[PDB]
Amino acid sequence: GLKDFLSNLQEVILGTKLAILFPAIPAAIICTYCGVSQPWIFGLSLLGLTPLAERVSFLTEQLAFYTGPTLGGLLNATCGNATELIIAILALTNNKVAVVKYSLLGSILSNLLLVLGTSLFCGGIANIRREQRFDRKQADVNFFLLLLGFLCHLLPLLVGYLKNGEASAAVLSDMQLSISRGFSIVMLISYIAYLVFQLWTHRQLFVISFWSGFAWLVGMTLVIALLSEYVVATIEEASDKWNLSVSFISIILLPIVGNAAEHAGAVIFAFKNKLDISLGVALGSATQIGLFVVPLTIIVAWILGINMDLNFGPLETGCLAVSIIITAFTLQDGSSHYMKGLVLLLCYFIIAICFFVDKLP
Amino acid sequence: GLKDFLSNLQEVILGTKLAILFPAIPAAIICTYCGVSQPWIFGLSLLGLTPLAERVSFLTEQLAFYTGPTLGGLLNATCGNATELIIAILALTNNKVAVVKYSLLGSILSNLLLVLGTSLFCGGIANIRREQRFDRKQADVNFFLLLLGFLCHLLPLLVGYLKNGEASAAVLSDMQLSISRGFSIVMLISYIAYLVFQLWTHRQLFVISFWSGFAWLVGMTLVIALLSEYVVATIEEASDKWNLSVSFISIILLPIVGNAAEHAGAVIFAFKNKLDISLGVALGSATQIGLFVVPLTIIVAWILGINMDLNFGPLETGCLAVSIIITAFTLQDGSSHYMKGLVLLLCYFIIAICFFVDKLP
Amino acid sequence: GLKDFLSNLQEVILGTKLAILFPAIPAAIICTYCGVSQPWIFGLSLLGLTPLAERVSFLTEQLAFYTGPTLGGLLNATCGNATELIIAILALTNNKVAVVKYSLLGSILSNLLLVLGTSLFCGGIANIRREQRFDRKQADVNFFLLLLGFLCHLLPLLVGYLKNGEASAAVLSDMQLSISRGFSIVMLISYIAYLVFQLWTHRQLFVISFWSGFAWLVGMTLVIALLSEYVVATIEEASDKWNLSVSFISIILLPIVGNAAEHAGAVIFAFKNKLDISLGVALGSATQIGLFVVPLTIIVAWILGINMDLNFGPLETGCLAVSIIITAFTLQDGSSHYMKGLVLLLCYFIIAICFFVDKLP
């Protein structure tokens, strides 16, 4: 009968290293259709979104054939972050700012100390006898923006420590709101400029048919629209039953799903002594989580009318501040060995320990 | 009759791009001689000092002919800051520490993110097909001193957050006074050394007659002695009538006067692919506002006997801290395109937004 | 009679530039055997340990002959810090955490701004006509670890400023204890890795008989076991009698003893235009005081059962934070003149002034 369906379905779905995580998807419908208790939904909906935040980033580079590298360049970093955009809007509209303030932070740390620190250790052992070099000038424009990102986080934090100023809490707490809803346009203009610089000004250095190819970016985002409602709506009741803090599930365990394609798609290229691509994945994804996914959520709240600023807290800011400074001194010469990467791993386990202990409301 | 006066007056005064801002000068005498209300004096005395903080820096490089580049090098950065030295002493002696603590700060930010960030954007569009390079080694000695400047600002800030120490306010607030009056000699010795390094040790890389030439640096500082009394003595009553905060007039609008020659004398040289000079203007002026104009005002107060420390606040320090770090990563390779400059502009509009909103005593 | 003793004793003991500081040693026994008042013991026991924290680092490089550079490399930085390890355990077991929290900090500052800043000034004047260059790649691995060290100090500081969290003091003060006893294993694994990187993976770039040679590392540590009990047990009563603060004796005057061999063993090599060795002494000693002597004391307390965290305070952290950032921009090109060194000296006198004034319990 239909001959376009027999082996093409073998070409799209099953051609991946995570074949066994698939049939835990319909049970998360079936347990929710039945009513099995809420931590058992949460255990499956972080296993039902690993081969869907990977079989979407597979289906970006098989959509550069019909559209060209101009559109196909932009959809690289767009659909590799097609989980944080789903969750950090389903959580904003459900009064749970906590998760919108950690999951958009936990993808900035995981794209800087675990996507990146593993792809220097786990490549530097393979190419220890060869010599490794990368392109500096591709990864200097990214740290300019991450310091435009950080200063927008620093100033609403320090307004909260102006208790001397003869102002109450409800006077200063709407001074953190008005200047965060105004930094968000200045963050968007320094990303729409960053596309023009990359896709038009400096383009010097910086299988499956298409009628079916659009089809598995229709359905396999809709299941991510379903298995993000189940994560967000039941994260309280599945943190009591494990005695993990919600500032550990939202900042560590949940940014393993959202960077499950940016991780095994970067340890591909670390073994080939091509660190230019495992710096275009690790850094070029953290910028959009810095400067497009964050200052769209501040606008989306303010269009809806929900109190949300850029205040992440005093403890979260020091971790984001050191991660940008340690990453800059690691990359400032263009030659890599493995000890540059083991230091980035152990500086991520420090962030895990401080947020594992912190059992505090 | 006098033939030395006819066209020489055309040579000195009128030869500038700001011919129309001149006849707003005598009205600021005439309205003050009459008694027109105080915001109308303040509107003219920031227009009467744009072509006088430019027609003095014109009359420095026409005084290198008779004196040589040894004296003529030092008077470059001396008389381009011949407005901040006038105002930040007329405000210290009038109980208005606020302006002495912002105008000496607003010239450190404007010499790092608006003098400098415009002269990479507004040159990088002109020379986008050519290639731009500068000298790193001229602009590494300047960032050593700006980190000697910052640490002298960090420690008196953190003494104010030692409320645990079993000490009152009036015990700690004279511990911020004794260590700020003692950091100021250590800041002066690392600038008198910086002149010797530049004017004597490493000199490898680093029209109008003179009897009339001294004359228009006599009078055209005396009018700056007059139109600085009118700015300082009437800045309160001309901030109520506009509902701008005095931490916005003293930190943004007033550092457009004091850097009106350092700005159009740096966008001259950005178009010639000579960025070595638009880094000797942008950085070499911020060091003196860092390390000579600030630690002379701490001494001048203490000789007079007026309580003034180096405490600028918690909100002002984070802006000064990021501006030194973002400027260092912008300059660390010696090749410029325009996207290095648009990031420095938009990181100055963040400082404008946080101080436009802050309507707080 | 014994011929192995006559001139060999002249070879071991007296062959040093500090012959006159020796006979102040037995008086510190004799005054303690008599009972002369306690500041007179403290004045001698910082003079009895200058030619013993030098005549031990002499007797390391005369123990590379029989053991080879594999063992003899490790004993360089081990016995040059054979005073801080003695004092910061004799003070931990005597309830005086103050000194364990300053002396392990005052050797991180003195190995970065006074061992290092003098060996660029006091060499750069000698070789001002020659040109000075060093190896960058030897001194990039050291700043990776010092930022793994700093972040372990930043997070227990900021837990103390979470008074909003609906938690008391005794709830948060054991959250600073549990995460400091857990960062200390992650600090040790990134130093045992640093030995393997140096002593086995990248060994490309990075007189006296031995039966007597072991003998003068037996006795001349035992006197350092004696003259460290006399410093620690009598530092209170010899700070009242001078009106110096104990946060000045423990952070300045006492880190002149512990870096008395790392100082005149680095100004040896600064005059020979060999700055590769005066960066392997200044930086390679600060890493062990960062990442082995500190996270062993946190374990040693916790094995004994004594409340000690990594909290050093808010004032001490800013000095440690700027010292790592100013040192990185000084070394980022591999060419030195003297003005890079005078800036590091005067940024150490700022730390002296802030802790000379601070007369506060």
PDB file of C-alpha atoms in Angstrom, chain A residues 113 128 131 133 161 163 314-319 321-323 325-326 329-333 335 337-340 342-347 349-355 357-361, chain C residues 136-137 140-141 143-145 147-148 150-152 154-155 158-159 161-162 164-167 171-172 174-175 178-179 182-183 186-187 189-190 193-194 196-197 201-202 324-325 328-329 332:
ATOM      1  CA  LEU A 113      30.034  23.665  32.740  1.00  0.00           C
ATOM      2  CA  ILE A 128      46.010  13.495  24.052  1.00  0.00           C
ATOM      3  CA  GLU A 131      47.050  18.679  19.345  1.00  0.00           C
ATOM      4  CA  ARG A 133      42.954  24.041  18.567  1.00  0.00           C
ATOM      5  CA  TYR A 161      19.328  45.525  49.552  1.00  0.00           C
ATOM      6  CA  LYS A 163      16.440  48.953  53.009  1.00  0.00           C
ATOM      7  CA  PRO A 314      21.676  36.280  45.914  1.00  0.00           C
ATOM      8  CA  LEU A 315      22.769  32.666  45.859  1.00  0.00           C
ATOM      9  CA  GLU A 316      21.976  31.996  42.200  1.00  0.00           C
ATOM     10  CA  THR A 317      23.804  35.085  40.967  1.00  0.00           C
ATOM     11  CA  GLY A 318      27.245  34.169  42.300  1.00  0.00           C
ATOM     12  CA  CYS A 319      27.056  30.831  40.498  1.00  0.00           C
ATOM     13  CA  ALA A 321      28.869  35.163  37.825  1.00  0.00           C
ATOM     14  CA  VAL A 322      31.727  32.727  38.314  1.00  0.00           C
ATOM     15  CA  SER A 323      30.640  30.515  35.407  1.00  0.00           C
ATOM     16  CA  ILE A 325      34.591  34.270  34.374  1.00  0.00           C
ATOM     17  CA  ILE A 326      35.998  30.736  34.601  1.00  0.00           C
ATOM     18  CA  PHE A 329      40.032  32.143  31.084  1.00  0.00           C
ATOM     19  CA  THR A 330      39.607  28.592  29.820  1.00  0.00           C
ATOM     20  CA  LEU A 331      39.171  29.738  26.213  1.00  0.00           C
ATOM     21  CA  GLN A 332      41.597  32.644  25.974  1.00  0.00           C
ATOM     22  CA  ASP A 333      44.327  30.952  23.973  1.00  0.00           C
ATOM     23  CA  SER A 335      44.520  25.271  22.686  1.00  0.00           C
ATOM     24  CA  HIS A 337      43.936  19.747  26.948  1.00  0.00           C
ATOM     25  CA  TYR A 338      41.826  17.737  29.335  1.00  0.00           C
ATOM     26  CA  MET A 339      42.694  19.556  32.568  1.00  0.00           C
ATOM     27  CA  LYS A 340      40.783  22.540  31.229  1.00  0.00           C
ATOM     28  CA  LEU A 342      37.975  18.477  34.533  1.00  0.00           C
ATOM     29  CA  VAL A 343      38.075  21.867  36.265  1.00  0.00           C
ATOM     30  CA  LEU A 344      34.803  22.767  34.572  1.00  0.00           C
ATOM     31  CA  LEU A 345      33.221  19.510  35.704  1.00  0.00           C
ATOM     32  CA  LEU A 346      34.124  19.859  39.358  1.00  0.00           C
ATOM     33  CA  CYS A 347      32.956  23.474  39.311  1.00  0.00           C
ATOM     34  CA  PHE A 349      29.442  19.624  41.187  1.00  0.00           C
ATOM     35  CA  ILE A 350      29.918  22.564  43.544  1.00  0.00           C
ATOM     36  CA  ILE A 351      26.665  23.983  42.222  1.00  0.00           C
ATOM     37  CA  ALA A 352      25.055  20.577  42.727  1.00  0.00           C
ATOM     38  CA  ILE A 353      26.112  20.287  46.370  1.00  0.00           C
ATOM     39  CA  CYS A 354      24.977  23.787  47.388  1.00  0.00           C
ATOM     40  CA  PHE A 355      21.527  23.128  45.919  1.00  0.00           C
ATOM     41  CA  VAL A 357      21.488  20.627  50.799  1.00  0.00           C
ATOM     42  CA  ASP A 358      19.385  23.769  50.576  1.00  0.00           C
ATOM     43  CA  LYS A 359      16.124  22.415  52.031  1.00  0.00           C
ATOM     44  CA  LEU A 360      14.588  25.809  52.557  1.00  0.00           C
ATOM     45  CA  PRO A 361      11.231  27.381  51.507  1.00  0.00           C
TER      46      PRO A 361
ATOM     47  CA  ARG C 136      51.897  31.488  29.703  1.00  0.00           C
ATOM     48  CA  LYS C 137      50.864  27.858  29.513  1.00  0.00           C
ATOM     49  CA  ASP C 140      46.991  29.083  33.085  1.00  0.00           C
ATOM     50  CA  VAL C 141      46.349  25.809  34.903  1.00  0.00           C
ATOM     51  CA  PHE C 143      44.224  30.165  37.690  1.00  0.00           C
ATOM     52  CA  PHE C 144      41.698  27.482  36.821  1.00  0.00           C
ATOM     53  CA  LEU C 145      42.112  26.032  40.283  1.00  0.00           C
ATOM     54  CA  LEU C 147      38.627  29.969  40.643  1.00  0.00           C
ATOM     55  CA  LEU C 148      37.634  26.528  41.842  1.00  0.00           C
ATOM     56  CA  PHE C 150      37.092  30.998  45.231  1.00  0.00           C
ATOM     57  CA  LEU C 151      33.623  29.668  44.436  1.00  0.00           C
ATOM     58  CA  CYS C 152      33.922  27.300  47.405  1.00  0.00           C
ATOM     59  CA  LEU C 154      31.661  32.470  47.887  1.00  0.00           C
ATOM     60  CA  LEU C 155      28.661  30.254  48.505  1.00  0.00           C
ATOM     61  CA  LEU C 158      26.088  34.194  50.816  1.00  0.00           C
ATOM     62  CA  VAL C 159      24.146  31.666  52.892  1.00  0.00           C
ATOM     63  CA  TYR C 161      22.752  36.782  54.004  1.00  0.00           C
ATOM     64  CA  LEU C 162      19.548  34.774  53.604  1.00  0.00           C
ATOM     65  CA  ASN C 164      14.591  36.487  54.698  1.00  0.00           C
ATOM     66  CA  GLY C 165      14.303  32.707  54.331  1.00  0.00           C
ATOM     67  CA  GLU C 166      12.244  32.072  57.521  1.00  0.00           C
ATOM     68  CA  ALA C 167      15.260  30.324  59.048  1.00  0.00           C
ATOM     69  CA  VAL C 171      19.525  26.639  60.951  1.00  0.00           C
ATOM     70  CA  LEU C 172      21.606  28.491  58.382  1.00  0.00           C
ATOM     71  CA  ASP C 174      24.728  24.371  59.926  1.00  0.00           C
ATOM     72  CA  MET C 175      23.942  24.813  56.253  1.00  0.00           C
ATOM     73  CA  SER C 178      27.407  20.763  55.740  1.00  0.00           C
ATOM     74  CA  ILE C 179      28.248  22.262  52.353  1.00  0.00           C
ATOM     75  CA  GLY C 182      31.414  18.567  51.220  1.00  0.00           C
ATOM     76  CA  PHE C 183      33.165  21.081  49.019  1.00  0.00           C
ATOM     77  CA  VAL C 186      35.794  18.273  45.523  1.00  0.00           C
ATOM     78  CA  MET C 187      38.696  20.604  46.271  1.00  0.00           C
ATOM     79  CA  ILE C 189      40.164  15.790  43.819  1.00  0.00           C
ATOM     80  CA  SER C 190      41.110  18.840  41.757  1.00  0.00           C
ATOM     81  CA  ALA C 193      44.470  15.511  39.528  1.00  0.00           C
ATOM     82  CA  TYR C 194      46.808  18.517  39.305  1.00  0.00           C
ATOM     83  CA  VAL C 196      49.044  13.745  37.854  1.00  0.00           C
ATOM     84  CA  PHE C 197      48.828  16.364  35.102  1.00  0.00           C
ATOM     85  CA  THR C 201      51.074  13.529  31.770  1.00  0.00           C
ATOM     86  CA  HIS C 202      52.737  16.766  30.628  1.00  0.00           C
ATOM     87  CA  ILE C 324      42.821  36.767  41.252  1.00  0.00           C
ATOM     88  CA  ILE C 325      41.416  39.155  38.641  1.00  0.00           C
ATOM     89  CA  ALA C 328      45.184  37.430  35.401  1.00  0.00           C
ATOM     90  CA  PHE C 329      45.316  40.648  33.395  1.00  0.00           C
ATOM     91  CA  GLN C 332      47.891  37.588  29.813  1.00  0.00           C
TER      92      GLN C 332
END
